[PDB]
Design a protein around this ligand. Structure first.
Ligand code: HEM
Ligand SMILES: C[C@]12CC[C@H](O)CC1=CC[C@@H]1[C@@H]2CC[C@]2(C)C(c3cccnc3)=CC[C@@H]12
Length: 460
């Protein structure tokens, strides 16, 4: 079993119509195969674009590849590799990941917290009846409150200016955080603001100052006899020790990861989903029929309705396939000498899963470039199915998403409540939203407007 050297690609030329980096590397697989590497100075990066090899990296050898590479921008955002998402493997990451996951067991109620913020969201949108608006902000408020309650048992009231403070440093960090090491090899894709690094520090300081103020004030509120939220879980763990792993700054960075991920991922997917529905009125009408028939207008949707709003479930699965939140996940790193397929991978090598490539494998999916929720239903439309093994929207293995349950609950309920109450149409001017996307740390959609109107079937 002597392993082979990885294919090494010496240069990455400009190629027309290749779009974003994840599609560019995907298309290069036709010439170099499903796994190949590039070198920058002393650092080697391997890109993996087939599900079998990806599952080896993520699952079968998940521990070998559970590291995270060091990057200047990621260092800034994670306060030098604290927190969860950008923390290297080891004792700090394992502890804070375990505690974050333990916190979600205290909400088994999650549906109730979410529905309360969605009702406020719908009330706010109904006030704009007849207008064409960007719904980013209202949705941002609802999911921000959900995660604030999970983290602190606090919620913001409509109009609180802190919501705008958070939205603006969120946008500022995301716009200046580059997680793609290879960008310098494909300079025509390196798109960042003028003074990127200082602007990133500027916005991160704002975030760190606000969270530290919350955490410091929370020391006065914490009691060991009531552990109901994430900061409680972290503070109790410090007391009950490990104690060096739970520094104030470690706790602050972990809270920051959850606070940011809990808002920017789900808000993005909601916007993507609505955009796809504006481009596919046929699907939208079938979603209205499904909800009117299985829920009606007597009551509001609940999580139990996931068993009967099957096309809605399929639509979300299809958005997560076609515009993945993380089309190249978060970069991995080999913690030890290891292997992928028949190839040797040295300790320290950066390993990137091209999830875009998995989600557009023409041999594992039928017409992968088009929005077809029905691929996740049987022919009758009566049961959800998994048509492909090349589908990993939340990752897998040791570094898999820890917010999946929350995300799926938020996405289902938000969409269901919105479809029950509102007609969602293209604006008066013809403008449809661009589906091209903006490949930042989250795969964002260009801002767009939607004509929203209370459905008159919802008259009473
Ligand atoms: C909304 C749809 C979401 C999708 C599709 C998604 C998917 C993903 C993916 C692909 C990764 C990277 C896996 C890897 O590096 O191998 C990830 C990591 C992560 N996600 Fe999500 N996520 C979503 C929402 C959320 C939410 C709502 C939260 C928290 C409330 C969250 C928290 C995290 C964290 C902390 C990590 C890093 C885990 C680690 O590095 O150990 N995500 N997620
Ligand atoms: C930058 C941002 C969002 C902007 C915040 O102000 C800072 C921040 C903290 C954590 C990051 C998050 C973006 C999404 C990240 C990167 C994320 C993530 C990414 C994709 C899927 N699930 C989670 C995990 C940690 C999250």
């Amino acid at each position: 079993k002597s392993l082979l050297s990885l294919p090494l690609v010496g240069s990455l030329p400009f190629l027309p119509r290749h779009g974003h980096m994840h599609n560019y590397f995907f298309k290069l697989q036709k010439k170099y195969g499903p796994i190949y590497s590039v070198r920058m100075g002393t650092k080697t990066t391997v890109i993996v674009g087939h599900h079998q090899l990806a599952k080896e990296v993520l699952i079968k050898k998940g521990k070998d590849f559970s590291g995270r590479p060091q990057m200047a921008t990621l260092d800034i955002a994670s306060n030098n590799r604290k927190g969860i998402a950008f923390a290297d493997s080891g004792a700090h990451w394992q502890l804070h990941r375990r505690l974050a996951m333990a916190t979600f067991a205290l909400f088994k109620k999650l549906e109730k917290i979410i529905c309360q913020e969605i009702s406020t969201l719908c009330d706010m949108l109904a006030t704009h009846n007849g207008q064409s608006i960007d719904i980013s902000f209202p949705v941002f408020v609802a999911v921000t409150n959900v995660i604030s309650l999970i983290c602190f048992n606090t919620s913001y009231k409509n109009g609180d200016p802190e919501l705008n403070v958070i939205q603006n440093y969120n946008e500022g960090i995301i716009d200046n955080l580059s997680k793609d090491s290879l960008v310098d090899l494909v300079p025509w894709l390196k798109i960042f603001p003028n003074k990127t690094l200082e602007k990133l520090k500027s916005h991160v300081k704002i975030r760190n100052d606000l969270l530290n103020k919350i955490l410091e004030n929370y020391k006065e509120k914490f009691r060991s006899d009531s552990i109901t939220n994430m900061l409680d879980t972290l503070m109790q763990a410090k007391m009950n020790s490990d104690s060096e792993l739970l520094s104030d700054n470690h706790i602050l960075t972990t809270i920051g990861d959850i606070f940011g991920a809990g808002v920017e991922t789900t808000t993005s997917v909601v916007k993507w989903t609505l955009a796809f529905l504006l481009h596919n009125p046929q699907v939208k009408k079938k979603l209205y029929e499904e909800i009117d028939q299985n829920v009606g207008f007597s009551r509001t949707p609940t999580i139990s309705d996931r068993n009967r709003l099957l096309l809605l479930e399929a639509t979300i699965r299809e958005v997560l396939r076609l515009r993945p939140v993380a089309p190249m996940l978060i970069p991995h790193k080999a913690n030890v000498d290891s292997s992928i397929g028949e190839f040797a991978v040295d300790k320290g090598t950066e390993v990137i899963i091209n999830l875009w490539a998995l989600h557009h494998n023409e041999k594992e999916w039928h017409q992968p470039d088009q929005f077809m929720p029905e691929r996740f239903l049987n022919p009758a439309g009566t049961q959800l199915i998994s048509p492909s093994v090349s589908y990993l929207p939340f990752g897998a293995g040791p570094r898999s998403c820890i917010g999946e349950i929350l995300a799926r609950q938020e996405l289902f309920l938000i969409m269901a409540w919105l479809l029950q109450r509102f007609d969602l149409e293209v604006p008066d001017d013809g403008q449809l939203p661009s589906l091209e996307g903006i490949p930042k740390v989250v795969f964002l959609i260009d801002s767009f407007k939607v004509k929203i109107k209370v459905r008159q079937a919802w008259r009473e």
